[PDB]
């Protein structure tokens, strides 16, 4: 008739689960029933726990590496037998076969954390037992068991009637950690297959007595009531031995009632000291919240928003920094390299292989200053050079160059930004920039080609542009010369002595004249030189000839005859650089408007949308907060304080219920 006892035990198991949810070792907890049993005694254990409420998944092949915190609720007003998982909150399971597949899947998965469980049934009384592995690597299981039983939990030991009592590791360890036998109750299972003379012997024992006594039961829809009826009728077979007025106590209902009483008593006793300790740790947590974070509230979404605004301000400063002259230098450099490409491909020497060269005799690159001004060869050469340079993918070159530049700045800005950690969000940002630039790339390119269409027809060069082209050509050409000489010296140091590479140069020059010819029947050795030495000699001769042409053409570009633009066909370098600079600058105008400005406008919106879709689609906002240690400690402190507050509230409500 102790409905109020039922309610008070319910409130206390609730507050226990709350304390468990503030964390392990981060607070004091309330006791509960710990069950232990030997191999046979533990099969009878899991079977006992089954029949203690209703059929649930146990046994079979179990790792038992993780305990199972069963928290039961008295379930009036609900007419369906449903059990739910707290970690998978708000998810209910109707059939315990699904619970079978789930918790046995957690079994096969195997941290040492115990899985919590909650089951509601009107038949079952609210309780709080935890099932750890039964005794049978095996040293570790006994370590965890010992650790669990040493603390003042109400330990529930089971023992099969077949095994001797002094042989059961369940009762033996029960007596190991509890010599008085004051906080342990015993259950003798599989008791149907013994004589009731054994029943009185095992259940009523003076060899290893204990308070709370032993309780013998035979454990094995409507399975609860079925096992109940079996308990009621089995004892009619031998009523005088274990029946009314017999000292022993049996059946499942009595075991459950006793469990409720003992749990209520032990828990209620520890309740006062636990309560005082919780009040202390709430005081301390509040103190740390004041001193270290100045009581500043924090949420994951707040962190994400603030850091995103920081990144946006940083990007704004960058965009104010970037502008158009940077594009000017970038494009003008790329077109410098293109000018070099054209001049080499149309005027200068080629790569080197063993076959002797075609003569190219009628006109040569060095007679250019003193050649016929009306020369069809030179006219055609400079004209096809300019046509080739202009009718090149200058649009796609500008688009891809500006794209790589912007993306590089975005990744660097990210490196210095608040998104240094959280690599997932960082990748979302970078990929957003990449997709915006990719979207604008084609339109930028095609538009640049259209804007260049009039300079493709007549890129008329003004004298000032010509002088600019002269000054720039000198620097570009001389820089290329220095690169050639550096690669030459590197070739010398690579091959060995300068004299050796000079010898291989003599051989390659000999093969380049008529003085010697070689056939390709043996591609391993030609001359007194190896195949690799020969290849390196070819590259060395190429570098030599290109270097000589380069210095000669630098002197020619510095000549007085190149001062005026009227002999453009005599000075292709300066002319091509003038064309390159002009194309570069007008392409830079169109690029800056179209691609750059579209990036400055679309980039923040794309960041916002893709980040939202990531954080809300992946549930990755909470993990995003978890990634940074400082904010993780901050949110952990806030959650801890809130949890302790709600716990104290429940305790005060309970104390109100039992005081008035």
Does 566 count as an annotated binding residue? no
Does 43 count as an annotated binding residue? yes
Tell the burial category of 14 from Cβ atoms under 10 Å away from its Cβ (0-12, 13-18, 19+): middle
**What DSSP letter does each residue of 497-557 carry, written as one string?**
-HHHHHHHHHHHHHHHSTT----SS-SSEETTEEHHHHHHHHHHHHHHHHHHHHHHHHHHH
Give the residue carrying structure tokens 């806030």: 638
Neighbours of 262 (CB within 10 A): 19
Does 44 count as an annotated binding residue? yes
Q: In the chain, what are the domains?
A: 30-264 (3.40.50.300), 306-517+526-617 (no CATH)
The alpha helices in 204-251, defined as continuous H runs, are 223-234
CA 126 to chain centre: 41
What distance, in Å, lies between the first and last C-alpha atoms of the chain? 19
Angle, nearest 10°, between helix axes 531-558 and 572-591? Answer: 90
Tell the burial category of 455 from Cβ atoms under 10 Å away from its Cβ (0-12, 13-18, 19+): middle
Does 232 count as an annotated binding residue? no
Residue 209 DSSP one-character state: -
Does 112 count as an annotated binding residue? no
Beta bridge partners of 82: 120
Tokens at 138, concatenated: 């095996």
Does 59 count as an annotated binding residue? yes
C-alpha gyration radius of the chain: 44
Please give the order of strands across the beta sheet that includes 92-93.
Answer: 92-93, 82-84, 115-121, 68-74, 128-131, 33-36, 154-160, 184-189, 214-216
Neighbours of 582 (CB within 10 A): 21
**Residues 553, 477 contacting (CB under 8 angstroms):** yes
Three-state helix/strand/coil letters over 240-308? CCCCCCCCCCECHHHHHHHHHHHHHHHHHHHHHHHHHHHHHHHHHHHHHHHHHHCCCCCCHHHHHHHHH
Contacts of 102 by beta carbon, 8 Å cutoff, 6+ apart: 85, 93
Does 395 count as an annotated binding residue? no
Method: X-ray
Task: Establish how many alpha carbons lie within 13 A of residue 360's alpha carbon, considering only the half-sphere containing its beta carbon.
Answer: 12
What kind and span of H or E run contains 644?
helix 629-657
**Share of the chain residues as helix, strand and coil, in percent rounded to the nearest 5:** 65, 5, 30
Does 221 count as an annotated binding residue? no
What kind and span of H or E run contains 156?
strand 154-160
**What DSSP letter does each residue of 348-415 carry, written as one string?**
S-----SSPPP--TTS-TTSSTTS-TT-HHHHHHHHHHHHHHHTS-HHHHHHHHHHHHHHHHHHHHHH
**Residues 632, 421 contacting (CB under 8 angstroms):** no
DSSP 3-state of 220? coil
Does 45 count as an annotated binding residue? yes
Tokens at 18, concatenated: 């709350």
Pairing of the two strands 82-84 and 92-93:
antiparallel
Beta bridge partners of 35: 131, 156
- Reference 35, options 161, 103, 130; nearest CA is 130
Does 164 count as an annotated binding residue? no
Q: Is the alpha carbon torsion for 437, 443, 449, 454 positive or negative? A: negative
What are φ and ψ of residue 658, in 5° steps?
A: -105, 10
Helices then strands (H, E): number in the chain?
Answer: 20, 11
Residues 574/576/580/581 CA torsion (nearest 10 deg): 20
Q: How far is CA 47 from CA 35, 37, 61, 69, in A?
A: 12, 11, 14, 16
Contacts of 626 by beta carbon, 8 Å cutoff, 6+ apart: 632
Angle, nearest 10°, between helix axes 463-495 and 498-512? Answer: 110
Tell the burial category of 290 from Cβ atoms under 10 Å away from its Cβ (0-12, 13-18, 19+): exposed
**Residues 615, 621 contacting (CB under 8 angstroms):** yes
**Residues 531, 523 contacting (CB under 8 angstroms):** yes
Q: How far is CA 303 from CA 298, 300, 628, 632, in A?
A: 7, 5, 10, 11
Residue 192 DSSP one-character state: G
Task: Establish how many alpha carbons lie within 13 A of residue 246's alpha carbon, considering only the half-sphere containing its beta carbon.
Answer: 20
Does 40 count as an annotated binding residue? yes
């Amino acid at each position: 008739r102790d409905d109020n006892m039922m309610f008070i035990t319910k409130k206390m198991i609730e507050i226990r689960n709350l304390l468990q949810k503030v964390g392990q070792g981060s607070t004091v907890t309330l006791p509960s029933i710990v069950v232990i049993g030997s191999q046979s005694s533990g099969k009878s254990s899991v079977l006992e726990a089954i029949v203690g409420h209703e059929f649930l998944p146990k046994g079979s092949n179990m790792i038992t590496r993780r305990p199972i915190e069963l928290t039961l609720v008295n379930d009036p007003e609900a007419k369906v037998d449903y059990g739910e998982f707290p970690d998978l909150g708000l998810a209910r399971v109707t059939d315990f076969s699904l619970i079978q597949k789930t918790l046995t899947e957690l079994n096969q998965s195997v941290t040492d954390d115990p899985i919590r469980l909650t089951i509601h049934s009107p038949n079952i009384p609210d309780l709080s037992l935890i099932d750890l592995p039964g005794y049978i690597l095996k040293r570790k299981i006994t370590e965890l068991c010992d650790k669990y039983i040493r603390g003042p939990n109400i330990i529930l030991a089971i023992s099969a009637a077949d095994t001797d009592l002094a042989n059961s590791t369940a009762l033996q360890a029960s007596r190991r950690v509890d010599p008085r036998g004051e906080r342990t109750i015993g259950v003798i299972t599989k008791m149907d297959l013994v004589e009731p003379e054994k029943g009185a012997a095992i259940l009523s024992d003076r060899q290893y007595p204990l308070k709370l006594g032993y309780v013998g039961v035979i454990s094995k829809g409507n399975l609860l009531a079925s096992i109940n009826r079996n308990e009621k009728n089995y004892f009619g077979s031998h009523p005088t031995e274990f029946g009314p007025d017999s000292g022993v106590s049996t059946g499942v209902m009595t075991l459950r009632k006793k469990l409720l009483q003992v749990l209520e008593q032990q828990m209620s006793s520890k309740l006062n000291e636990t309560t005082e300790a919780i009040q202390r740790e709430l005081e301390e947590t509040t103190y740390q919240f004041k001193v270290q974070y100045n009581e500043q509230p924090m949420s994951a979404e707040s962190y994400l928003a603030a850091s995103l605004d920081d990144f946006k301000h940083q990007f704004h400063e960058f965009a104010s920094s970037f502008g158009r002259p940077q594009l000017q230098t970038l494009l003008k450099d790329a077109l410098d390299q293109k000018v070099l490409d054209q001049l080499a491909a149309r005027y200068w020497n080629r790569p080197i292989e063993d076959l002797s060269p075609a003569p190219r005799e009628p006109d040569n690159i060095i007679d250019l200053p003193k050649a016929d001004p009306d020369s069809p060869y030179w006219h055609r050469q400079l004209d096809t050079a300019c046509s080739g340079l202009t009718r090149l993918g200058v649009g796609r070159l500008a688009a891809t160059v500006a794209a790589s530049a912007i993306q590089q700045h975005v990744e660097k800005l990210l490196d210095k930004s608040s998104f240094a950690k959280h690599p997932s969000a960082r990748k979302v940002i970078s990929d957003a920039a990449a997709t915006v630039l990719a979207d604008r790339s084609y339109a930028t390119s095609d538009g640049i080609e259209i804007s260049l269409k009039p300079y493709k027809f007549d890129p008329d060069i003004q004298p000032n542009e010509w002088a600019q082209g002269r000054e720039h050509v000198v620097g570009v050409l001389q820089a290329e010369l220095e690169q050639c000489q550096a690669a030459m010296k590197a070739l010398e140091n690579s091959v060995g002595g300068r004299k050796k590479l000079k010898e291989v140069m003599s051989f390659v020059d000999k093969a380049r004249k008529g003085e010697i010819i070689v056939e390709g029947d043996h591609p391993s050795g030609a001359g007194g030189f190896s195949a690799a030495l020969l290849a390196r000699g070819r590259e060395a001769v190429f570098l030599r000839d290109r270097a000589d042409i380069l210095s000669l053409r630098i002197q020619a570009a510095k000549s007085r005859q190149c001062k005026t633009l009227t002999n453009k066909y005599y000075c292709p370098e300066v002319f091509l650089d003038a064309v390159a600079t002009k194309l570069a600058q007008t392409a830079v105008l169109f690029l800056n408007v179209e691609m750059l400005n579209d990036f400055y406008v679309r980039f923040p919106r794309e960041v916002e949308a893709k980040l939202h879709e990531h954080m809300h689609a992946g549930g990755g906002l909470e993990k995003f907060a978890r990634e940074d240690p400082k904010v993780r400690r901050h949110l952990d402190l806030i959650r801890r304080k809130e949890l302790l507050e709600t716990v104290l509230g429940k305790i005060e409500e309970l104390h109100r219920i039992s005081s008035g």
